[PDB]
Design a protein around this ligand. Structure first.
Ligand SMILES: [Zn+2]
Ligand SMILES: [Zn+2]
Ligand SMILES: [Zn+2]
Length: 178
């Protein structure tokens, strides 16, 4: 197995996947790495299994249909993975913890949002449909773009949003378009 965490790329106390060479810190994995379970399969392996069991799940889908899906176990897992894929980018540090807003000429957002809050919300089963999760994720980047206006720091929101959207289209097999 790898000797660094797949998500944060650091060594430390790592838990090893039994079905692939990835490793994770306890709370870098989503959900948090489970207490017992030998063997243990990581979220990448669990997602691969869903695809393998139902090869047709990779045919193209409309976003509108995906968003209305209820958060049954497989959709809950897919949102967990998508959240994990955003954390995998080092630029996710900017969006992880609760922000604050005090900048001359801007006002803070009406509804602040951050990754750790989405994490907790997923863990507590607060989303009933995929739409709930996706709306909160997109609000993270929209709030950032709106607040930082013309500062070049706005690009960080664009960059991490692009990682989110690419992963969303991949994980939920959104129909490719021009
Ligand atoms: Zn880690
Ligand atoms: Zn694995
Ligand atoms: Zn099938």
């Amino acid at each position: 197995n790898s000797n660094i965490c797949e998500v944060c790329n650091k060594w430390g106390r790592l838990f090893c996947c039994d079905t692939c060479p990835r490793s994770f810190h306890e709370h870098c994995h989503i959900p948090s790495v489970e207490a017992n379970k030998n063997p243990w399969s990581c979220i990448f392996c669990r997602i691969k299994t869903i695809q393998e069991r139902c090869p047709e799940s990779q045919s193209g889908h409309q976003e509108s249909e995906v968003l209305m899906r209820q958060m049954l176990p497989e959709e809950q897992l897919k949102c967990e993975f998508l959240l994990l894929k955003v954390y995998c980018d080092s630029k996710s540090c900017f969006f992880a913890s609760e922000p604050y807003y005090n900048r001359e000429g801007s006002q803070g957002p009406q509804k602040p949002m951050w990754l750790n809050k989405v994490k907790t919300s997923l863990n507590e089963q607060m989303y009933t449909r995929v739409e709930g999760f996706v709306q909160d994720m997109r609000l993270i980047f929209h709030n950032h773009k709106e607040f930082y206006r013309e500062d070049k720091f706005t690009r960080l929101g664009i960059q991490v949003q692009d990682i989110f959207e690419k992963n969303f289209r991949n994980i939920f097999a959104i129909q490719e378009t021009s």
